[PDB]
């Protein structure tokens, strides 16, 4: 004899782990998290990840699997695909990528060859960048580079860009040289899904995204594309068997949940407060004598510049983290400090907006941040900001007990 499965929780079986899980959750409850790529996903999303779908091995694609018995995981994968399509108005969707990496990689695997040329931002790679003049994209510097290098793929997609990416300008630049236009909207996808930000899905030939971050789903990857018989065939094969074995059906059910969520009016209202909270904070920092790259934001993040303050990005990271405010050091256009030191921080409001922070809460939070950095990380300043932070976090819990 050996035991059968009962209803044995992690607490009853593994108190060492259950204590560590609990410390993390309280740390998460008692910390303001302003890392632009971070969110808290719903109890329903977590329920799908916790489902018994982890027990199905479904090697392949729906209706054309390798092993049988996939009558209902076919419906679940197809539901996620169709919801993805309806959400972003795509004609193709692959919901099997385990992560954003596995989705981006499969785009390159399906569209490029040994030593092709790619034009992207900081295989034969060529860079393009931001006119520090504008703090925005130098579309003429992208223009001339494609004509001069004739890449087979221009890549558009950014992790610290606070303005609207001109997807259409990128399209005709990639049409003049015949390149592929591949867009990674991982950071703005939630904003795109609610309609608060222009949609590259119909423009580019292939668009990928994380399902977490602004999309507020599970940690996973997704691929979309405009209709294209030959391309759709490649993306299929590059995912599986090019990069992956079987999909994680429980994360695929979690994707379907989150896509349905992102279709809601409540989700549009959430993304609209996400934007107004970021705009609010940028106004406070400007009014407090700070610089914001490109002068403000149109989305959920911005870069706070620290040059005028003579503080490094690493230093400001640590001080704020010690006050239970969480950011990351980020380099600014033409940053005169090294990439491991930087002259800025990246601040995003998706997470604080999710636990119900409004404009009044984030304007104060920005004041507390400016209090810490101005003081050059003074201990008494950090002590007071920590206590203020821990109390507003208690007043705005993420998940309801």
TrEMBL record:
Pathway of action: Amino-acid biosynthesis; glycine biosynthesis; glycine from L-serine: step 1/1; One-carbon metabolism; tetrahydrofolate interconversion
Main location: cytoplasm
Cofactor(s) listed in the protein's UniProt record: pyridoxal 5'-phosphate
Record bears the keyword Amino-acid biosynthesis: yes
Residues the record lists as N6-(pyridoxal phosphate)lysine modifications: 213
GO terms (BP aspect): glycine biosynthetic process from serine; methylation; tetrahydrofolate interconversion
UniProt-listed Gene3D superfamilies: Aspartate Aminotransferase, domain 1, Type I PLP-dependent aspartate aminotransferase-like (Major domain)
Sites where the protein binds (6S)-5,6,7,8-tetrahydrofolate: 229, 338-340
One Pfam family per UniProt: SHMT
Enzyme nomenclature, EC number: 2.1.2.1
PROSITE patterns: SHMT
Catalyzed reactions per annotation: (6R)-5,10-methylene-5,6,7,8-tetrahydrofolate + glycine + H2O = (6S)-5,6,7,8-tetrahydrofolate + L-serine
Top class in the EC scheme: transferase
Annotated positions for site Plays an important role in substrate specificity: 212
Family to which this protein belongs: Belongs to the SHMT family.
Function, as annotated: Catalyzes the reversible interconversion of serine and glycine with tetrahydrofolate (THF) serving as the one-carbon carrier. This reaction serves as the major source of one-carbon groups required for the biosynthesis of purines, thymidylate, methionine, and other important biomolecules. Also exhibits THF-independent aldolase activity toward beta-hydroxyamino acids, producing glycine and aldehydes, via a retro-aldol mechanism.
Name of the protein this chain belongs to: Serine hydroxymethyltransferase
Origin organism lineage: Bacteria, Pseudomonadati, Pseudomonadota, Gammaproteobacteria, Moraxellales
Gene: glyA
């Amino acid at each position: 004899h050996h035991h059968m499965f009962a209803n044995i929780s992690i607490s009853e079986f593994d108190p060492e782990l259950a204590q560590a899980i609990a410390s993390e959750d309280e740390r998460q409850e008692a910390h303001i998290e302003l890392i632009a790529s971070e969110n808290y996903c719903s109890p329903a999303v977590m329920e799908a990840q916790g489902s018994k779908l982890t027990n199905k091995y479904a090697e392949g694609y729906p209706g054309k699997r390798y092993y049988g018995g996939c009558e209902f995981v076919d419906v679940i994968e197809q539901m996620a695909i169709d919801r993805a399509k309806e959400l972003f108005g795509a004609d193709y969707a692959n919901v099997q990528p385990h992560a954003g990496s596995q989705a981006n990689s499969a785009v390159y695997l399906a569209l490029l060859n040994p030593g092709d040329t790619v034009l992207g931002m900081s295989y034969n790679a060529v860079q393009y960048g931001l006119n520090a003049e504008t703090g925005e994209i130098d579309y003429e510097e992208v223009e001339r580079l494609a004509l001069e290098h004739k890449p087979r793929m221009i890549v558009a997609g950014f992790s610290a860009y606070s303005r609207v990416v001109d997807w259409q300008r990128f399209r005709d630049i990639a049409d003049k040289v015949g390149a592929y236009l591949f867009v990674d909207m991982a950071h703005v996808a939630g904003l795109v899904a609610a309609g608060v930000y222009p949609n590259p899905v119909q423009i580019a030939d292939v668009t990928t995204t994380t399902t977490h971050k602004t999309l507020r789903g599970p940690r996973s990857g997704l691929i979309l594309a405009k209709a294209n018989e030959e391309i759709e065939k490649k993306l299929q094969s590059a995912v599986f068997p090019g990069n992956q074995g079987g999909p994680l059906m429980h994360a695929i059910a979690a994707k379907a949940i989150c896509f349905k969520e992102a279709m809601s009016d409540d989700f549009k209202a959430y993304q609209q407060q996400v934007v107004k909270n970021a705009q609010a904070m940028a106004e406070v920092f400007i009014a407090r004598g700070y610089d914001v790259v490109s002068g403000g934001t149109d989305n959920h993040l911005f870069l706070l510049s620290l040059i005028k303050q003579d503080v490094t990005g690493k230093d400001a990271d640590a001080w704020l983290g010690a006050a239970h405010i969480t950011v990351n050091k980020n380099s600014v256009p033409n940053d005169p400090r090294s990439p491991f030191v930087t002259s800025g921080i990246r601040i995003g409001t998706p997470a604080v907006t999710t636990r119900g922070f409004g404009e009044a809460e984030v304007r104060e939070l920005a004041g507390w941040i400016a209090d810490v950095i101005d003081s050059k990380g003074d201990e008494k300043v950090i002590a007071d900001v920590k206590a203020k932070v821990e109390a507003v976090c208690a007043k705005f819990p993420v998940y309801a007990k």
